[PDB]
Every structure is written in structure tokens, then in C-alpha cells.
Amino acid sequence: IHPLPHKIIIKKRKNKFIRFQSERFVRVKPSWRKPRGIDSPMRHQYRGQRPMVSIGYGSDKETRFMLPCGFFKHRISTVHELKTLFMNNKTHAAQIAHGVSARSRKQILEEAKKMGVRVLNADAKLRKEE
Amino acid sequence: PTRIRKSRKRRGHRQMGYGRVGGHRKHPSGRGKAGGLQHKRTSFDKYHPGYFGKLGMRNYHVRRNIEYNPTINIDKIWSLIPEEQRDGFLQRKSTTEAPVVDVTRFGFFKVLGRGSLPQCPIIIKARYFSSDAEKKLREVGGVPLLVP
Amino acid sequence: NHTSKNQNRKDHRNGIKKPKKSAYTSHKGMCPKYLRNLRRSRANDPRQSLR
Amino acid sequence: AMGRNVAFSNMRRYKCTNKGPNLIKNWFNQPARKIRRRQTRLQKAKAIFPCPLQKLRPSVTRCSQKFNLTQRIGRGFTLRELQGVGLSAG
Amino acid sequence: GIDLKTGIKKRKVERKEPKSPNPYIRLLHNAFKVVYENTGEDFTKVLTKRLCLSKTNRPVLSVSRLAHLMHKREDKIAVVASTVTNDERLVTIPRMTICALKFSATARSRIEKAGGRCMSFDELLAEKPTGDNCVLLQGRRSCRAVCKKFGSPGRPNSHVKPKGEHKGRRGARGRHSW
Amino acid sequence: AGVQCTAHSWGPGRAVARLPRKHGGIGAYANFARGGHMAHPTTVIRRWCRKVNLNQRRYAVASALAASANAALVEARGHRIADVPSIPLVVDTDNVTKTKDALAIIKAVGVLRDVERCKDSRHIRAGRGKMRNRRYITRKGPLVIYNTEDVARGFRNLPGVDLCHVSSIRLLELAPGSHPGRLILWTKSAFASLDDVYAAKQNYTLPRSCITQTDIERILQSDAVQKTFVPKRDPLVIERKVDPFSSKEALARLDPSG
RNA sequence: GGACGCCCUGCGGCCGCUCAAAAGACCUGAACCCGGCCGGCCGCCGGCCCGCCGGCCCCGUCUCGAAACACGGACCGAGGAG
RNA sequence: GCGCGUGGGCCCCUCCUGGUAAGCAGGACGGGCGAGGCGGGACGAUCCGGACGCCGGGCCAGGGUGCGCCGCCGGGGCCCG
RNA sequence: GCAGAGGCCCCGGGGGCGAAGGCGGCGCGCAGGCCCCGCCGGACCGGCCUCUGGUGCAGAUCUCGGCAGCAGUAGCCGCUAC
């Protein structure tokens, strides 16, 4: 329920890299694509251009994949799976899968409380019965 | 396996591995082995010696069966003999019981000599025998008999 | 159209390759009489490789 | 590859690929052909139940100095051979 | 920025591990590497490399060659990273102790009929990881026809046969031809 | 397909792209045109079959039967084998023609839980395959190898279970999903015939046995191997540079008199 | 496959009804585009409470060289080429 | 060993041929652009510096330091830029 | 990342106690992308391992379908007329 202490999580870039000329056209979706033009201001990386994706922006290995709570995430879609995930696991937390129905989530939460594995989405889909 | 292929990785690059200054266009070097005496003489001379010209007499029909002549070396004659029989033969020697191997029956017509026969005497039967082969078997005390 | 600029940089990219050890000591172009006598001298006493 | 050292290909150019007689012969009927020949064979066997499907054929030296040592099966026994046993051809 | 392009000569690439799916070859390589990491014996480093090489760089050695090579020393245990193969020409075969990666069944039968054990690299690690009284042997690497076709057939100093049928006279009969 | 229509490139000068267009002016005959031929049409000339050497096929079938014997390989594949007494499971079952008789055999030999994993695993598929006559998928269960024991009728409708005469074991069956390790309920004739079946293979000789990581570890831990090992030189001390001049103790390591 | 009542000169509207749902001429109902109501003064990138300072030419493409008074491109969706 | 692109190049030096001469036409050592971000030279693909992972300090090249627009004063000489 | 195929998902994977899909909002990843939440929707859908391919689009005077601004614009000026 409480994560091990760990080290400060530093994110090198706060805002997502966006593809060149994403703002100008709806057809160009924000998904990053490498600058490929012969005379692309982006490929050259001229002053005032959007930043380019580089391995340098990599998060510290120990903090990589870790969620803000301090635990990491391993998804669970059933109760058997949750007992396997928590077995010998004080470094991870379980997000109930979106597919899991409201009826089944009650079983997962009740087992999780016994297991001691934190559930990130414990309040999801809670509306009494049918 | 299409997934694990160079072309799929090169998607997203435009020219797809074929260049900008020169692009993939249809047959820009001609089709087939063409221009081997003109534009491609450099390659044909460098890697293809004897490609152009006529060099020999012509047989309008070739009768493969008569031009077929299988040969066996003097080293493998003992190998043809089965092992159980062969191991005793070498210790026993004996002019009277010397092994007869009809290389023709095994499937070879001419005996050439590439190696050395074992000293125990052997009688070889074949359609033809090379002179070095005749000499070596004669040294091992064997006989080069002919077969019909 | 003719121009040889960048030829020396291209040649020196990993060049200045020496000829090879077999080339320096070879029996090619040597005096045929020298070659014949050399084989006879070799074919005697320790150097002889004849069976 | 592009030039370099490649032996030249001796496969002839495809003909009648777009129009004309079908010069491609597919073999996806091959397994079905096997069942068909057995079924025709089974039907024929029953029609002459006591008799063997194959007739007696003669041992014959395989032709050429290449295979002159071995023997194979020929179309039919010679009149002289049948006379030696004492059987007329019919 | 630093000038690292003057006296540095680029990075060569070598086979650190076998690319063979066979888990037994991969296991032996790890074992002979682990031994050489501990005891730096040349024989163990060289075996590790020869296990790693490809089939083309791992040519077969017949019982006949092994007989000639070990003629001086019967005691010494021969080691071949490639498979051993039978020689039908060698009617009589000596007594040999050979650790091969694989033995042709006919060769295995002949060597053991002559009283000599057909060892395996698993046996070698168990008895002599050091390689005391052991010789590492290799097949003629240039025995493949592919190795005699390499080159430009056609230049005057070629000594390389043309690649394909040819059947013409230009160049085929002398430098003066053409 | 797409070639059935008549379309001609209108040509340059009409302010329209040069792609074949019909009488109306409708784009046709191109991979990009709607109704056009695919750029490289699929053909049945493709090689749908891949050749395998007999030896390699036999090696695989044999290593698959061998995998069944490994106790963990079966559990790894996904069979439920805790109640199974032994691997390989050899069961003397006489001719069985009734599912209830076969079910009792399977229950009394430890395989009911595997059969129940299969029975309670039937669901509709996740794709157009549902529509393409492949609607239901079940979990694969035991393989009963039968020789002259006519148990085929009894075991056929049991869920997830399959049958195969020792005459023709199938490698796609032995390893379902290219993952070997299938519980096989051998009839007793099938085991007693395995040495016959595997010798009737012309002069095929079984691949010689090899080693395992544990049997490479035991070999590695042998006294001779450990005795050869020579400990290495003690490693280097790195210690990141700090200014030596600033501190008295720090300067004393390099300049004690100073 | 639309109970009723209310009105409407009338149209039609309005309620609601049937049904799990209007699913109402039809399953889901995206983008473009547009109308109300509300909220701002505004392209992008960075710093900051957030409207100020600083930096930013329009891509693709041939090309020695493109922001080019070179060429193609209104916009969006689907299809589209080792 | 096995391939790929490329086989229209252009500039800055320095020596050139040639033309009366050019952002001219041909040659060559090197470097540069091509395919090299960044700072400066007001502006300039090539000039002067610097040749690039993501960053936080410090140092400081080249060019500058009235104000735009970051950053300077002191001394000697000269003066209708 | 896509779409199928063979397996697995320890009482036999997730689903009317709400699937796929759509719309906004977090979170993780250098990114390709993923995940979860809320809402709509209304029956299917996956993760890993092995396999397959007709497998990823800003352009091609691209194809087809939709549709904007121009724009309540140009115009509705033949045949004498109500």
C-alpha cells in the first residue's frame, strides 16, 4: 500500500514531442515522425524549431516505467493473476484491466486487500449492483 | 517471412533504398545480358572469360550413354569389398583366394590410380586400366584382368 | 568536367596498402636458368622434398 | 548481384503469361489424384476378383552400356520364350 | 569536439557467441568460455573461438587426416571443432582418442573398432578443461568449391576458373585472344 | 479483377491526372483507383508448401515424444499433471467404446482436471475467423496413442482429447503451437510397439543423447575443472578525482611532507 | 412503425406514448464544416501564472543551391506503391 | 567475403590558362558546403569562430560593448567619416 | 503498431455487474505507441509465445465520397406589355 523509498523521479522533457507542421494541418496527426525533408528546417534543427526525439531524453533507469505513486504497474484481469503478480512483489501495483466487469472487480479488490498489493484504479466502475 | 524483411524497415524513407539523384526506373541498363560487347564489356571481360565466340567441333546429336565412362581410383577398390569379408582377407593374404572385384559390377568401367592399395593381393576386373593403375596393382602382386 | 579533387582524400581513406610478402619474394620474371638450377639444389640432402 | 560475379541464368523467358494457352500447371490436385487412382484400382480389382491387376511381364536387360548390368520389366514375352515353355500366345 | 579519426582505425566485428540454435553447442561454448575466463589457457580461448565459428569456417577433418597428424603422438588427445568423417580409402585405421563435436556413424564405428574412444567436448571439459596432452586441429578451410570461384576470372593474373558454362574463345585461349 | 473494364488514360492537357479513366471519366485500372486491380495481384502460383528432409522430420517427431516424458515440459505446455502418477502415462486400457468408461479411466489416472480445463475453455474466436467457419476454440488436452486397442470411439467426443495410432504420430499434435510437452496416455500396446515402430524406420538411427545445463553445471563444478581455475589479479581502484591541494588529509596521500 | 390531450384558420407544432433504448426511417455516427449558449484574443517552441519577453520563411520535391517571381498542394475522411 | 549508393557538383584560399573583363570559362594543393546544428559577420549553403546525446553550473573563442540590443572604461596620437 | 493462424492464459483468459467502436481527460515510454478513468455505445475482444502477410500515408495535375470560403455573390438584359 506504501511504495519502497526510491530516488527523485526526474523527467527530462515535460511535454510530448509533436510532429513537424502538426498545427498547420489536421491530416498531419500529432504522432511523432522523423524529420525527412531534403530542405526540412526540422531535420537541420534550425533555431526556433520544435525539439527532436533523441535517446538522450531517456529517464533514469531506476525511475523508468515507475508511476507517480512510487509503485510500477503490472495489469491484472483475474484473481489468479493477482496472486501471481503479488507473489514476492513489494515493488509493483496492479491496475485492474478495463475489460474486467464490475462483478469481478469486487473479487480482485477483496483479494488485493489480503495480498497487500496496491490497486491504482480501486474506485473504477463502482455503482452498487445492476 | 515478409515481416522480417529489409523492405518493411525501409518504409517511411520515400526512395525505399534506391537513391534520390538516380531513382529506380524500369531497366536503365537494358534487359538481360545485353551490350556485353559494348557498354558492359568491362564486366564481361573481367568475370566472364570465353563468353563470346565459337571454340570447338560440333556433334549434332550427343549419345550420352557411350560418352559415359565412370571411373574408380585404386584407393577405393578395397572399400567396395564388404568390411566383414575385407578384414579377414588382409590378414589371410593367399594367391589362390585373392579377392576378385569386378568394378564394372559395382558401376565403374575404368580403374585410375590415385592412392595406394593395401599389400594383400587383389584381382581387379574392369573394361580399362590406367598405366599407373596397372603398375600399382602389379606392385601389390594383384592382376589387372579385363571383363566382358 | 574532368577534375581530380578529393581523389587523394578518397585514396587515403584506409589506403597506402603495401604490395604483399609473396610479391616481394616471387619466382615471376626471374631468370629461367636461375629457376631451373635452384630446383636442382633444393632437390638434394635436407631441402629435398622428394619421396 | 548487380553485375559482379554471377553465372548467367539459362531459364527461358515465360511465354503466354497474360493471354494464350495456360503454361502454368498447378499440382494442388496431386493428393486428390492419389485417392482417385486407388479408387479406380480398387474398383478394377473387384471386377476380376481372383485375377491379379498386373499381367506377367518379362525381365529385360535395361538398354545402353550404362545400365546393361541391371534388368527391368518389358512389354511382353517373345514368341520364342513362350514356345520354350510350350504356351501359344493366346 | 575531439579528432578521433586520425590514428584510430575503426571497429572490427567478430563472432563472440555461436549463432547455432543447437542448445548443446551453445552450452559447450559457455562452458569453455567460463573455464578460459578462470584459467587463461590458450587452448581454452582458441576452442571457445572455434566452437563459435560458422560451418564455412568449421571444415570437416576425416579419420585419414587425423591419422597422419597424430602419427608422431598416440597419447595426445586430438580435438576437432568440426565433425569427423570416415575415409573409405584408409582400409586400416590406427587407435585414436578424438574429441569431436560430432562423429559420422561410420567413423565412430571404425575408431572404436580399432580400440580408440570417440570423446565429445562434454567429456573433454570433464577430463581435461586444461587441454593437457591435447592438440587442436582444423580442416582445410579452403576446401569448398565456392573458395576456388572467388575472384575475377578474366583478368590476366587470375588463376580462377570462369563461373558458368562459357563455351566460346574470347579470352579462353590466351591473353592474345581478345 | 479491375481488368474487366475498358479505361484509357485521358491524356495530358485536360487538367486531369494521367490515370486510366472510363467513358464517364471515372478513375479505373490502378492500385490507387477505386475498382482498380491490386498492384501485385495474389496468385496461387505461390509456394504454399515447404520441403523437409525425412531425417529432420523424424528428429522432430522423436524429440517431441521425448519432450512428453520430461515432467516439467508437460506442466510448462499447460497440461494439468499434478494428479498424474507417472510420465510417460502408460495405461493398459482394453477396447473402450463408451465415453463414460473412458472418462472413468481418465479420472482414475489423473487426467480429469486436464479434460475439464479443455471442456470449460470453449469460447467464440476473436476475429473474422468466427465468420470464416472457425467460430469455436478449445484448449488442447491429452493425446491417446492406440495400437489395436479400439479405444478411439470411447475417447473421441471427450473434450480437447485426440487419438493417434503408433503407426502415424503427428508432430503438429505432439507439439501443439510449436511448443512440445503434451500429456500422452499411451495404450500398453503403443508403448510395447514404440521400439518396433522406431526401428521399422529403414536404418534410421535415433539421434545420440546430449547434455543439459544442470549436467553442464555438475560437470563445471567437478574438482578437475575447479582445480584448473587460477584466481585473477586483484582489480584496479578507480576513485573519482577530488582536488588534492585543498584538504590536509587529501594532500597528504600525494604530498605527505607538504 | 408512434396512445392521448393541448392548441393552431390551418400546416404543423407541443407534450408524451410504444420500447431496454428511440433505435422514429432508422446500428455505431468520427473528421471536415456549421448554428446557439458560455468563455477568451488568440500560429508554433521555451520561461514563467498566462499575456509578456525571447526564438521561429512553406511544406514536399528535383537541385550546386528553394521562402522562392520553380513545380504539386482548398479542406477532411477512406483506399493507395519492392 | 558480400553488396549499396554515387559517377550533373559547387565554393573559400593559392598558383593558373584564357577572355577586354564578371556572381565568366576551363585546371590544381588543401579545406569547406554538399551532408555540419550553434555564436558572430545587419541580412549571405560555403566568410570568422565553433563542428551537435539530455542537462545544471563555471570558463571563454570569434565578434563586439551610446540606445534599439546582451555587454567599457582608461590613456597617447589623428580628425569637414 | 495492424490483420489473420497454431498454442497458452492452474478449477480454466476478459465480456448485458456492458465487448468492439467514438469523444474528452490523466498516467507510463527518448519515441513509434501503450494504459487507465469518465461519458456515449450495444456484442464481442484480447495479452504473451510460435507462424503468416494484400501490414503503418500530408502529397502522386492521386482514386472515390463528403463539403467549406468566395456568397445571399455573379446572374435570372432575346421575342414592344401589361
UniProtKB/TrEMBL annotation, chain A:
Single GO cellular component term: cytosolic large ribosomal subunit
On the tree of life, the source organism's domain of life is: Eukaryota
- Cross-referenced Pfam families, in alphabetical order? Ribosomal_L32e
Which GO annotations describe the biological process of this protein? translation
PROSITE patterns from the xrefs? RIBOSOMAL_L32E
Task: Extract one GO molecular function annotation from the record.
Answer: structural constituent of ribosome
State the InterPro entries in the record.
Answer: Ribosomal_eL32 (IPR001515), Ribosomal_eL32_CS (IPR018263), Ribosomal_eL32_sf (IPR036351)
Record keyword Ribonucleoprotein present:
yes
Query: What keywords appear on the UniProt entry?
Result: Ribonucleoprotein, Ribosomal protein
Q: Which family does it belong to?
A: Belongs to the eukaryotic ribosomal protein eL32 family.
Know the name of this protein?
Ribosomal protein L32
Cite the source lineage: Eukaryota, Metamonada, Diplomonadida, Hexamitidae, Giardiinae
Automatic annotation (TrEMBL), chain B:
Indicate the segments forming the Large ribosomal subunit protein uL15/eL18 domain, all copies: 71-143
Is Transferase tagged as a keyword?
A: no
Pfam families found in the cross-reference section: Ribosomal_L27A (PF00828)
Q: Where is the composition biased (Basic residues)?
A: 1-14
One example of the protein's molecular function in GO is: structural constituent of ribosome
Report residue spans for region: Disordered: 1-40
Question: Could you tell me the Gene Ontology terms of the biological process aspect for this record?
Answer: translation
Keywords of this entry? Ribonucleoprotein, Ribosomal protein
- One cellular-component annotation, GO: cytosolic large ribosomal subunit
Can you tell me which family this protein belongs to? Belongs to the universal ribosomal protein uL15 family.
Q: Which HAMAP family match?
A: Ribosomal_uL15
**Protein's recorded name:** Ribosomal protein L27a
What taxonomic classification does the UniProt entry list for its organism?
Eukaryota, Metamonada, Diplomonadida, Hexamitidae, Giardiinae
From TrEMBL, chain C:
Q: Which GO terms describe its cellular component?
A: cytosolic large ribosomal subunit
Give one GO term, molecular function aspect: structural constituent of ribosome
> Superkingdom of this entry's organism?
Eukaryota
What UniProt keywords are attached to this protein's entry? Metal-binding, Ribonucleoprotein, Ribosomal protein
Amino acid composition bias (Basic residues), ranges on this chain: 10-21
**The keyword Ribosomal protein belongs to this UniProt entry's keyword annotation:** yes
Q: Where is this region: Disordered?
A: 1-51
Q: Name any Gene Ontology BP term.
A: cytoplasmic translation
Q: Which residues bind Mg(2+)?
A: G15
Question: What family name appears in the similarity comment?
Answer: Belongs to the eukaryotic ribosomal protein eL29 family.
Query: What is the name attached to this protein's record?
Result: 60S ribosomal protein L29
Organism from which the protein derives: Giardia intestinalis (strain ATCC 50803 / WB clone C6)
TrEMBL record, chain F:
UniProt binding sites for Mg(2+): L19
Q: What are the UniProt keywords, alphabetically?
A: Metal-binding, Ribonucleoprotein, Ribosomal protein
List, for all copies, the residue spans of the domain called Large ribosomal subunit protein uL4 C-terminal. 202-257
Q: What does the entry give for GO biological process? A: translation
Kindly list the GO molecular function terms attached to this UniProt entry. Answer: RNA binding; structural constituent of ribosome
One GO location term (cellular component):
cytosolic large ribosomal subunit
**Homology family:** Belongs to the universal ribosomal protein uL4 family.
Q: What protein name is recorded for this chain?
A: Large ribosomal subunit protein uL4
Source species, please?
Answer: Giardia intestinalis (strain ATCC 50803 / WB clone C6) (Giardia lamblia)
